[PDB]
Amino acid sequence: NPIHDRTSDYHKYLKVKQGDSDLFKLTVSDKRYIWYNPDPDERDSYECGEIVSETSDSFTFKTVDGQDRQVKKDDANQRNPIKFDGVEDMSELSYLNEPAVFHNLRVRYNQDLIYTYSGLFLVAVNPFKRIPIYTQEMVDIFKGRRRNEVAPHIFAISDVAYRSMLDDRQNQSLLITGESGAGKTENTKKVIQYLASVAGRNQANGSGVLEQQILQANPILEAFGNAKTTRNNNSSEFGKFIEIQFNNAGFISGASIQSYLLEKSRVVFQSETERNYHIFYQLLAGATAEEKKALHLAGPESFNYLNQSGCVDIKGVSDEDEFKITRQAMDIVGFSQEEQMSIFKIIAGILHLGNIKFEKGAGEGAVLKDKTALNAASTVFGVNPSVLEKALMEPRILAGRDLVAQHLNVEKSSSSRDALVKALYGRLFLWLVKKINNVLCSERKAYFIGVLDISGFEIFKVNSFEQLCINYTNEKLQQFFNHHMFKVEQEEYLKEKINWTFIDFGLDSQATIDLIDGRQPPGILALLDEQSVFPNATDNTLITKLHSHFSKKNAKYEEPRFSKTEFGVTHYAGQVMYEIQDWLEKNKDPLQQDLELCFKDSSDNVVTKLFNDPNIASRAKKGANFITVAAQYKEQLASLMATLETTNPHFVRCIIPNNKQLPAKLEDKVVLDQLRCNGVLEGIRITRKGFPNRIIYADFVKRYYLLAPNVPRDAEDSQKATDAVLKHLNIDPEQYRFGITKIFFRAGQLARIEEAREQRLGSEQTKSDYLKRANELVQWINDKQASLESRDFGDSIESVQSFMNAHKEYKKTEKPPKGQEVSELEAIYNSLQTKLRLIKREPFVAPAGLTPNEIDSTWSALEKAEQEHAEALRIELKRQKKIAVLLQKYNRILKKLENWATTKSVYLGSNETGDSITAVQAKLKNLEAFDGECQSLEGQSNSDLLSILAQLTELNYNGVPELTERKDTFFAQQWTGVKSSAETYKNTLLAELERLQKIEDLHHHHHHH
Amino acid sequence: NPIHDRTSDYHKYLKVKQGDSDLFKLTVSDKRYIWYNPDPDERDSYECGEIVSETSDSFTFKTVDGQDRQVKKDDANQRNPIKFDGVEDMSELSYLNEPAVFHNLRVRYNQDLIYTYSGLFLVAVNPFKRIPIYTQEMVDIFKGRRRNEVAPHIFAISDVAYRSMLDDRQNQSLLITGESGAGKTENTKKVIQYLASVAGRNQANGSGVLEQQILQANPILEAFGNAKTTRNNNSSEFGKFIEIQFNNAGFISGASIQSYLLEKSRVVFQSETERNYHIFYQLLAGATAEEKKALHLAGPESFNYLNQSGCVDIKGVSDEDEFKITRQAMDIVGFSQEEQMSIFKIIAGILHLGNIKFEKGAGEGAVLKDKTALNAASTVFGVNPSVLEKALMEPRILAGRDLVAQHLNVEKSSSSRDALVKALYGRLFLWLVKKINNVLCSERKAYFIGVLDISGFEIFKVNSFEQLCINYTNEKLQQFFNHHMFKVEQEEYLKEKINWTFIDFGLDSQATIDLIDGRQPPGILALLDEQSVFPNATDNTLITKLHSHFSKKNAKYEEPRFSKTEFGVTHYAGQVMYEIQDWLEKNKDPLQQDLELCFKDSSDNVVTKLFNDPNIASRAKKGANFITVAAQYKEQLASLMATLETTNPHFVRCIIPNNKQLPAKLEDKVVLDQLRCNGVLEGIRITRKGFPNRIIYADFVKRYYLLAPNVPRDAEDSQKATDAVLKHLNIDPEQYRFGITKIFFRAGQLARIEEAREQRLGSEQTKSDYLKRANELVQWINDKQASLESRDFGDSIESVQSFMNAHKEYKKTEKPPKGQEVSELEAIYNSLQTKLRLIKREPFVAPAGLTPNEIDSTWSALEKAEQEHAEALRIELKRQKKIAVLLQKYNRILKKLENWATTKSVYLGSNETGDSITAVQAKLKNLEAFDGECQSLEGQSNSDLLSILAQLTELNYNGVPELTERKDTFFAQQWTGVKSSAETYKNTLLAELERLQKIEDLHHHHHHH
Ligand SMILES: Nc1ncnc2c1ncn2[C@@H]1O[C@H](COP(=O)(O)OP(=O)(O)O)[C@@H](O)[C@H]1O
Ligand SMILES: [Mg+2]
């Protein structure tokens, strides 16, 4: 059950990658967008702009670029809310418009999700690269699962088809259409792969080989009906309706194949760059030396029918390999070696017949001055070259009741040949289908599931008769789908008992169908049949009859105002201009009776059977002039339609992402056009009209319960819980209906409800972010103010200035950003308060100080603290400076006395030279001039030192102590040391005067002696 | 014998479309053309023109309009004469020009002849289409044949080399070089195909196993070493040297292989349009569903290494078919099933590593959010995703002396991963190779022929290190060639005994070689090895070092003025600018050691060998250091040149016809360039120096005998005959040299001679056209004259007048033409004489009658007959109308008479009022007045007419008798009528009177009564 496991490959390749979260907080954006085209030029180009504002009935938006535009709500293409991105079914989109539909497709495509539903439709966009979603594991995941129980997938459509066959005992059909290269044939194989798998009986020697034969039939038909073209390297050049037959118990019992419009013209002509049918290249490449010589085979390089396109290989294909694969298929299906060799002989013959050169000769008739080709053809075909040569250039025409030989010229003889080839090829292809059916088809069958694999409407620059046939066929399928849609859609409205009925519908295709295949009056196909049987008549006598029958007489017809070879009918997908050129002959598909007679006698089993069995060599039977081509097709389609009408249909629409076969390249012009012609968009325009969104009450409540007062997500009465929400959101009661199991919504209503939920959660996310930002801001202010209220500033002149320098910094750098925030939060606050006003919710009541008013006051306070901090600094610089002048003075005074305490230390400590009372004592008159100055130099200095100290003290200068000490230490030291020194100078210089008074009088005692 | 049978395949596919008459019938034109540049713009584009008239200094030629340009005879490029077109060997051309060499190559390529010789070279142009020349029948044609015995072919070179081996007991080598997609690999396959046919042990017990393997090794290497590029869908991204080993007897006994410069960068990156190596695509496409969910495989575009170019497929190739072929081939060679899954797991891992997405981490380093890839990679590789995650993002460096892990920024995280991938790829390839060599190689080999499949000189927009390795290699090889060419050239002159000395021309091949691999002084590689091991050395540091070592010094080196990151070296093929970016990293080729450890401990058998076996994981350790990539290469090239110099070599040059991989489009610009670089044009420049053209004597005479008087096609003495032709044509004996077996000529000489053969044949033809036109002319002139001289111009005016108008027409229609012819045959005769003088032979002398001078006279005579003719006509019309007037006069006369007689015949037939003798005899007088005039008319008239008859007889009017009779009748018819008739009237009047006067007489008797 990998269905439930985000890691399984089923989730990896078939489910939209989610962020694995169910709760909330997943939506961080809730804006409303609108899809618009910048330049009204490119209608398919789209941009989405944010809805700026809206009026009573008209939005106004901001183009992704700049300028604003306005549109009336009526034409507005609103973008669906993000939850709708990637929905598995377009029907789940609330806003149902073209760019919306395309957007969802893009979203899924960029994730490699290629299958998506759209109502009854399974849309499948070609990925142009292999994606691993077709493994056996994937197959097993889809068994018995229901359409809405698993992701979109070709396998899901197949299983539902199968279960319905069983559970309803009714036939089913898978109608797969779309452009060339869109992926029809690949999905068609997948459908059959799935069926062979879940309903094929195992072994038992012969019961399980059947499943092998069915699957192997396609390889065969593909080789002969497929070719490389500018649009597809493996283009299908024929319609195909496979029918898988089942028995009562539900097991595969057989299958039959139906072929349509095989483009035979490709066998003789290829547009540059294309290739002929695959077998041609497969044979010339895979053949063996014997086979090559026996068939006179050469190389592509040497065959007209194979060497005019300048292309003989295909990207990634080995024609050698293919041949073997094709041979193997024929083996399993039961083709005998005889038959195969006969088949490859015809392919060989056709090649040679194209190498027959018809030159002009004497008589301006037609000659064949060479036989190589002719002989080679004849040899493999099994017919004498003489008759063939005759039947080619001189066919025997019947003039009355007697036949006489004619002589075609060159170009008329060439065509005759071209027609034998086209005839030979068409009949061989039919033989194969017939042969295959003989082995696989069971005459009696309980039920069957058919798969129609054919192109949708074709509209080239030149549309011929082949084009009218296919567009006619799609007119019928489209009508068949319109009838089924309105059927299945009405049964939905009854099941749920919703009283609603359509009144629009989409103008039927009946009128156009008739303009083409009408009886009375005669349609385009009737006339062409009439105009192609009346003797002398050409293309120009045909269109003329058409103009006169329809121009200005039928609304679906048109006679071009600038051409007389074309005419146009208005099909579902738009008007197509058909070129009348060659229609008469195309509807006649002519082959010389002589050529039939010739090959009618071929010695080959298969060849002779191609010209003898009327069920293959001729059309129906009128009783004179066999049914025409157009008449034959009309009959086949009539048959196909009658079969489909006895089945329960399933529609798969294939889309090509671009015209360059590129992966990862979804182009809007290309996609949108396809969606405007395949019915997908017409389908949405129709259902959009009623109640397109249907949700099962419980699922509704599980998601929107929180929009109503007290309902639980798992409310026990879902229907009543749903009414609660609808009422509370005051939704317009006309916008919905209470179905039996689901709640119905008109277009846009669901989106509006989903927007409400986004607005809600957005409302709370904003509320949340604001609180976080409001706090982070208040906090920042509280912290800065704290810092600014401090008064440290430290203590020097450079210290305070570094703080003044910081404050200038925080005002230029930090303040501004914090200021923006204040006014930005106020903006947010008011927006939220207003948003909450609508949204029908309680007003916002913020915490203590997170109101825009309180944040304003809180900010005014920080501004007031910023100033007081500023004033505090200037005043502290004043002080700090004063302190520096007083400190300088102090230091100076001491640096003074200190120096004097050394200068005068050289005075006291420095004596004289000479003993007596002249050079000794008669000098100490200076000492009295000394201690007279060093008694004032103290009384004046210490007086200043103190006066300075008191001041510093008055400036609460915490540094006074160490000052007063350095001072006190000085005086009680250096100063006294030298102050006392003056003793050993006044006492020692009066002591040596003892020996100048005592030893002085020994020479004074001579005046007595 | 296919060789001599103008209807066999050999002659249809390998021989120019010849003829069967060596006699005289193939050279109708004798005009000498020249090769010029229509627009001086393109140097390699040419146009041929006619030679006006040379001078004893230069030429003069007419373009393809009337732009007669003149060119220095010593500069001109003459076009060889038709006989040289298609020669199997370029050296047989006389005029050796570039446009001349190209023309020959083109004449042959246009007939699908892709092989041509040029000296020792075998030139092979890619045909881009299949040509039936490689079948076993073709193979058989070459056994024991000499290069000159059969047509040019890759098979001839192969056999010659194989004979030389067995004959000389000497090893051989075939060197195949050329641009990408030139066809090097295809021809290498042929050489081997062929060697297996002539030397493979037929097919004994298990003998036909070795060769079965030697062949199977290719699919293997090509699967891992080839890829689709803009130039080749199967480009070999590596060079190789195959060695086919044979025993004593010539039996193949083994094979060895060697790879060179495998471009590892491709595994992680590819340009728009290109693909990664083939296996990546083969695996994803050919893996069985189990293998797919064992290696975690997915589609091509799901892998980064595979979805960056936009291309995932190849024309005509099926990656699943190829994968099967690769596996199948691996079995034949020996890879056990185990090994094979090991190889695919590594290929798978590399792919997975590519998806590991690194992204900006929580900080600045890198982190890995999604672990899917990483885990997948680890799973197949067999390693702990735990350590793998660390080794990639947090590698342990050895900073200091410890192991301090790191954290690389997202950018450097991816590089390391890109480094691991490349290391992983290079080692696997190198491993596959050794494994193949284990099975095929044998140390006991009697001899060997080695085939070198490698690219030629590369010169791209941006050239890097790899380009240098390749251009250096081609420097050696081109020097190896020149040594072998000099050696062989003197051999031809010595034998044959011609005294001639050539130069050695190799004086700068060493100059370029040394500038690159030089040691002292150090060459670019020496400075890169050094710089590569200098701390902090950067790319811009190496470019600067390179500049101060060679810029403005070594004449082969060059410093661009604009680019700072580029530098240029002059190679053999031209200046090559090399970008320095990344060289230091390339030469070092690092790989985080932690990433070595993580894998060293791999659980996988193969992975282990790749990281543990030093023979694979390492370049080679000198112990003290490792060998740089440059050194490693240097030694491998050395080993190769070593082997190649122990062999007799054969050189093949592949050329690509254009840059669009299309057939039938040989383009001058493209081809010439290659011829100019691969050494072919050079060789021709040198070969042009001595004596290029050398013809066998008897062969020369057999063709140019007619040039020398009386020399027979045969001659017992071919030399004397040759001389008699050279002397007679007067030729400078410095322009040739008598060899012993053949005669040698200098460039341009054999052509001049052939131009003389042309001119004689032309003369002879002119001389024939002349007579055919002269004889016809005179025979015509002669007849008009005999015509004009006739004088029978009929009889009335009309007759003569018609001849006058006929003479008028003649002079305006039939004459002018014959006039020019007269004067044009003169010019032809004059010119013819001038020419006959230069060819050196007898002057022309026309038969009696024919010749300008005699023709003039014959025409003068006609011019006279014309004038005498007109005069005769003039004088005859005079006589004719002169006769007309007389004829009129004559008739008028007879008319009067007739109409008169008729009137006087009525009168003579009635007598109604003659009743009176008076009225009657009076009426008889009127009858006498009648006989009066009737007489004077019968006389005058007959006299007039008679005078007219005499006048006519003077004009020789032969119609006289016829006129007379007419006359003599009247006067015996009508005239004698009236005359007699007159009497009837008279004989009645006479009577009615006579028989009345009788009454009147007897009645007159009334006189009495
Ligand atoms: N589902 C797919 N997965 C991979 N390739 C696809 C798928 N569908 C289509 N393609 C590609 O488109 C090509 C055309 O598809 P096809 O079915 O042939 O187109 P149609 O049938 O409409 O003409 C394929 O052959 C293939 O290359
Ligand atoms: Mg199809």
Ligand SMILES: [Mg+2]
């Ligand atoms: Mg190659």
